[PDB]
Paper text:
[name] ([name]) is a protein of 127 amino acids that self-assembles as a 55 kDa homotetramer that is secreted into the bloodstream by the liver and into the cerebrospinal fluid (CSF) by the choroid plexus. [name] ([name]) amyloidoses are a group of systemic degenerative diseases involving multiple organ systems and are caused by [name] aggregation, such as familial amyloid polyneuropathy (FAP), familial amyloid cardiomyopathy (FAC), senile systemic amyloidosis and leptomeningeal amyloidosis.
In the present work, we investigated the potential of the registered drug BBM as a [name] tetramer stabilizer. The two dimers that form [name] are related by a crystallographic 2-fold axis that runs along a central channel. The channel displays two hormone-binding sites, AA’ and BB’, with similar topology. BBM molecules bind deeply within the thyroxine binding pocket, with bromine atoms at the inner side of the cavity. BBM binds [name] in forward mode, with the bromine-substituted ring occupying the innermost part of the T4 binding site. The two bromine atoms are anchored in HBP3’, comprising the side chains of Ser117’, Leu110’, Thr119’ and Ala108’, and in HBP2, comprising residues Leu17, Ala108, Ala109 and Leu110, respectively. BBM binding induces the rotation of the side residues of serine 117 of all four monomers, prompting the formation of strong intermonomer hydrogen bonds which presumably increase the stability of the [name] tetramer. BBM shows similar binding affinities to [name] in buffer (i.e., similar ΔG values) compared to IDIF, tolcapone and tafamidis. These ITC results confirm that BBM is a potent binder of [name].
Numbering used by the authors:
A (entry chain B), B (entry chain A), C (entry chain B), D (entry chain A): 10 to 124
Amino acid sequence: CPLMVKVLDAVRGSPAINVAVHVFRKAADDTWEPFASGKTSESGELHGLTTEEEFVEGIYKVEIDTKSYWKALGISPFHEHAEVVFTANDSGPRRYTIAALLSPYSYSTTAVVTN
Amino acid sequence: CPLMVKVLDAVRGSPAINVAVHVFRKAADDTWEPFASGKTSESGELHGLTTEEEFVEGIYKVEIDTKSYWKALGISPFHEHAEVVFTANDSGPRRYTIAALLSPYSYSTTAVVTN
Amino acid sequence: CPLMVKVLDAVRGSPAINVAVHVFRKAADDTWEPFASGKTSESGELHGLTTEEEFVEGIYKVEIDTKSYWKALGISPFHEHAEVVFTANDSGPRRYTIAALLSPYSYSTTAVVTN
Amino acid sequence: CPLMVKVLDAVRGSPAINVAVHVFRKAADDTWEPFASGKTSESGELHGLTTEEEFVEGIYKVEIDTKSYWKALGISPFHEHAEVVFTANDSGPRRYTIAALLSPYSYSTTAVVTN
Ligand SMILES: CCc1oc2ccccc2c1C(=O)c1cc(Br)c(O)c(Br)c1
Ligand SMILES: CCc1oc2ccccc2c1C(=O)c1cc(Br)c(O)c(Br)c1
């Protein structure tokens, strides 16, 4: 709801299905603590990672496990994963879509922030 | 010198070699007239398309023959070609690099304008 | 329904709203004939361009009017527009999403093809 | 020589100049140890990060300080930084270029691996 992840495959022209996504939040002791995780659906989307109540101000890292995605397709990719690090909700609650477009040696990521 | 084209391959993580590139300039009657062409080098670059004397202000189209590139690699592509259409202006910087990053179902293009 | 266009703004992190989109289909006389047009919604999406009945096999060009989008925002962009040229429905009907991500000197486009 | 970083600006259509770049190598205990760093040149490039002798197989992280880059331009950014994580392998080609294309709410990264 407040945080959604969408992943596309630039080789097949398709949603990237069953991609593992791990979200971390930076803690007071400046360490990365686990916040939420899931896998993308048949539409390439991952909903329900968190709630408005739990998604407080902070620095978040969305790690998209691109290497295991490509390896499951029989491809040896370049990157270990795609990491998206950003401050969230510093100006009040927002809704964030973190999108990634994947190729074996390249990826792009963008944020769509609304409300 | 005033206009360079660089093409990269996001699947192989390499320069895109031997890619045909056609440049057109818009004529008075809204027709695309051929201006310059070539094939990318082993570095993925196409130099020597034009000269300062010939590269006047105008609307230019750079067509990158991506479909034939992917077919030569045995890879099934989406686009017929990649087309980059832009106005060249003399008050902005006067070296133009048109770069493209290719995947089978996606491409990105950027302009690097210097000096 | 069979053809959707989605446009995002990489500067604001938002849908690109009210972007003009023109679709052409290559005719027998190898000319570009108008096929459909519209403008993106508040979600950055353009639905209803065509129907299954009208969206026959062919070579299509989706022209996204990026220059007028940026100029309306007070920015002088590099490109005249973004052009996406592809063969559609050659293996039977498909559903096509043509997506574009816009910056003043760069754009990316990808195709999501389903069914 | 074996590792180069290049950073481009998609808003201005220019090299991204004076961008801080930090490279880390994964240690035995899963900690990121500092490996090399620098700032991009006027061409947007960072050369001389390492030598062939020092750049052994391993997992590397390239952190590009995009937030400070956008702040210096008076532009409001989304990401804290851009992070590129990859394994270097000796049997693949042995020159690595890590390239990044930056917008305020989006970035793309690709690897160009040659020789
Ligand atoms: C080796 C990578 C690279 O080499 C260059 C040489 C001259 C000018 C630009 C570049 C360049 C980048 O443009 C680049 C990075 C990404 Br990510 C792209 O999606 C596109 Br398109 C271009
Ligand atoms: C909200 C982001 C989003 O919305 C979609 C709706 C339908 C199909 C694809 C997408 C999509 C993408 O992941 C996307 C991501 C990047 Br990065 C791009 O450069 C481009 Br272009 C598209």
